[PDB]
Write a protein that binds this ligand. Sequence first.
Ligand SMILES: COC(=O)Nc1cccc(NC(=O)OC)c1
Ligand SMILES: [Cl-]
Ligand SMILES: [Cl-]
Ligand SMILES: [Cl-]
Ligand SMILES: [Cl-]
Ligand SMILES: [Cl-]
Ligand SMILES: [Mg+2]
Length: 346
Amino acid sequence: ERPTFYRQELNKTIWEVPERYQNLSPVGSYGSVCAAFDTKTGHRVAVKKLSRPFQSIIHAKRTYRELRLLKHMKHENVIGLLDVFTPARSLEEFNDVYLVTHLMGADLNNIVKCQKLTDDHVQFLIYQILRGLKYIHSADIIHRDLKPSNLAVNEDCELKILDFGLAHTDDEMTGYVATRWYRAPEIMLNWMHYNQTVDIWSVGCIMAELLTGRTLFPGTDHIDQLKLILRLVGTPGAELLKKISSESARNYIQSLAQMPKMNFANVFIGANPLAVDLLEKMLVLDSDKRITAAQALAHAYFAQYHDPDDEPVADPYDQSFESRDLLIDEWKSLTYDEVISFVPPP
Ligand SMILES: COC(=O)Nc1cccc(NC(=O)OC)c1
Ligand SMILES: [Cl-]
Ligand SMILES: [Cl-]
Ligand SMILES: [Cl-]
Ligand SMILES: [Cl-]
Ligand SMILES: [Cl-]
Ligand SMILES: [Mg+2]
């Protein structure tokens, strides 16, 4: 049952992998990644060797979290898990984890900056993001880090969501950085407990950029970005102010001069009127009032692509481990069980 493994040192790293994976070639370095040819399936694949997966309780729980999430995702518009392996023959010598996925080429950046997009292209790309999100949200999963570099696109305009937020540092979110330009205001400034509606804000930011070729809210810091957002969508009323839990944050908002919501047809000049209408329903300051992924799929902007018999939901996903307190070796044993129970797709 156990395959034969072979060892090799590539760029100061030891890689021990099953014989099926050939012609390993480093491509990036969290973990290190190699491209390879999988002789069992015929696919070009990415093989990621996790870096120090069990060095702390926090790191061991993050390793388990990532493996549980990747094993669950089975949808055309979401990255899935092709294989997971360890060279260890027992729990006692278990130390290294390797994850195998389809090798992705271009991301949405490699097209948004370098192609001329028709409205039909925007329809199809945003449709696929929303189709994947309906699936993800049905399992009570929040992606949290949707942005163009986390969307893989091929030559036929087919799209997959990847790089789920596994819980970014303070430094990474500081200044003039794309890591923050797509984040909902309530999570950027920790206004309140957030939920899956944060992902819909991100989709609105992405759709605007596909239509205009420009970043929607390219703030130089958190406060500059908030000012760009409030100039477009308006300052909050008392109803949303009630829902912001920090007194200082409420005090800060009330120090700003009030502004009305702008006319989106005069911002997205020349855009399909149905695209303008959908943007107005995603880019709503109060997260309770944003359109959901399931509701957006039925919007008339997608009439050409919507098929309610081919927009599936996910199997239920048990996240009870997140509130559980365990020792490093217990998280490590749970991870080992998940490695050895993996069953590959058809
Ligand atoms: C700051 O200028 C704007 O207000 N709007 C803008 C800028 C650049 C491109 C587009 N394009 C667009 O809307 O295509 C549908 C719109
Ligand atoms: Cl996949
Ligand atoms: Cl090992
Ligand atoms: Cl990006
Ligand atoms: Cl005022
Ligand atoms: Cl589950
Ligand atoms: Mg990424």
